Design a protein around this ligand. Structure first.
Ligand SMILES: [Hg+2]
Ligand SMILES: [Hg+2]
Ligand SMILES: [Hg+2]
Ligand SMILES: [Hg+2]
Ligand SMILES: [Hg+2]
Length: 417
């Protein structure tokens, strides 16, 4: 409408419906392809999802220094794309072999960089795209809920495709989503207008200092969130690493236990989208902390729950819980962080607690998770994590800063208005 003649909306919206069609491939069916197509150690998928986190942490950062000190040049974001023209050659001809030709540490390391154009590129893409929403007038959130259908159709299509042939994907994702999610450039923007003639605006900014850090470090309420963050999350995070094959087991053909999976995920948007609607409202009445516990109570139940699975139906209810949670989490982390911290801090709070610490707590965790799914298989390991996760959760109905104890409108309603 207000975008019909608006072209970069189409451009970057479509660029969003392609960067996320690939996501919808590479991500949910990673476990499957690894372990099945490649047949890989129930504990060595850990040394992979492991190197995965150790780098998304060496890049999520350095990618800031680019994402902005670079501004409107697609440059960086063009490496990302070109690197994704080789999705195929890579897994098929390099990633797959390296691992499998059982040289595996020296194959993930040297193969966990096409994880760079995903872990610390997926957000990176999402930035650049809003810097355009500005200059070009889109409700960024109108073009991002564009790349949401792509990851919905992604899963569905891909899964069904995947079975039929794992190969006829890395070739689809490497073109179907590459040559376009790349060709969507020769038609773009740069113009130092629609911002300020000089530099009065153009691309929102912020700061992350040492003292800032050293200040938070002084703060306990930072620590208690660093508790919930490393405790409930990181832990849940890895729960999902492997979970996909633990899924496919409760099914007829494994080559049917996939599709279903691709389905449970496609229906996620079709769920989470709705959930997301109310959410705020709710979050803002329930009060952050509470809603962060709400998320651990589930996260938690899903782990323990899974540790007691017997059938398929159950397992297709655990994979559906992961959905209610998420909303109440990121949206919760947001509303708590904010209701509990100095806006100046906010920036740093994320990098420091949500990127440096969790990815760290995961470089380690997902190794003893795989080393654990061996000595005790899944369901056993699930009891461990399930408890450690719920434990911490009760510990937070205590630690996390309640609903504004020494300020309810100056440290709770202040940022609000
Ligand atoms: Hg694709
Ligand atoms: Hg952890
Ligand atoms: Hg969505
Ligand atoms: Hg968050
Ligand atoms: Hg980091």
């Amino acid at each position: 409408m207000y975008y019909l003649k608006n072209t970069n909306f189409w451009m970057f919206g479509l660029f969003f419906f392609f960067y996320f069609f690939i996501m919808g491939a590479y991500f949910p069916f990673f476990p499957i392809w690894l372990h099945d197509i490649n047949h890989i150690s129930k504990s060595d998928t850990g040394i992979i999802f492991a190197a995965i986190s150790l780098f998304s942490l060496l890049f999520q950062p350095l990618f800031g220094l680019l994402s902005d000190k670079l501004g409107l040049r697609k440059y960086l974001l063009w490496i990302i794309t070109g690197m994704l023209v080789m999705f195929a050659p890579f897994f098929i001809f390099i990633f797959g072999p390296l691992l499998q030709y059982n040289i595996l540490v020296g194959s993930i390391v040297g193969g966990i960089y096409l994880g760079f154009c995903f872990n610390a590129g997926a957000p990176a893409v999402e930035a650049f795209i809003e810097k355009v929403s500005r200059r070009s007038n889109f409700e960024f959130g109108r073009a991002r809920m564009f790349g949401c259908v792509g990851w919905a159709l992604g899963a569905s299509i891909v899964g069904i495709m995947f079975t039929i042939n794992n190969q006829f994907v890395f070739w689809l994702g490497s073109g179907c989503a590459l040559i376009l999610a790349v060709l969507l450039f020769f038609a773009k923007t740069d113009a130092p207008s629609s911002a300020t003639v000089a530099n009065a605006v153009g691309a929102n900014h912020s700061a992350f200092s040492l003292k800032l850090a050293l200040e938070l470090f002084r703060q306990p309420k930072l620590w208690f969130l660093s508790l919930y963050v490393i405790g409930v999350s990181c832990t849940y995070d890895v729960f999902d690493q492997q979970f996909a094959n633990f899924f496919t087991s409760f099914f007829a053909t494994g080559e049917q236990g996939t599709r279903v999976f691709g389905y449970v995920t496609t229906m996620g948007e079709l769920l989470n989208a709705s959930i997301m609607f109310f959410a705020p409202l709710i979050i803002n009445r329930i009060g952050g902390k509470n809603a962060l516990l709400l998320a651990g109570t589930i996260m938690s139940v899903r782990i323990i729950g899974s540790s007691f699975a017997t059938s398929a139906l159950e397992v297709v209810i655990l994979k559906t819980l992961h959905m209610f949670e998420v909303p109440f989490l990121l949206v919760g982390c947001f509303k708590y962080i904010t209701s509990q911290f100095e806006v100046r801090f906010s920036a740093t709070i994320y990098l420091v607690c949500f990127c440096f610490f969790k990815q760290l707590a995961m470089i380690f965790m997902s190794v003893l998770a795989g080393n654990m799914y061996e000595s005790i298989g899944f369901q056993g390991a699930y009891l461990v994590l399930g408890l450690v996760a719920l434990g911490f959760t009760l510990i937070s109905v205590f630690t996390l800063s309640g609903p504004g104890p020494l300020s309810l409108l100056r440290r709770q309603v202040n940022e609000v208005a």
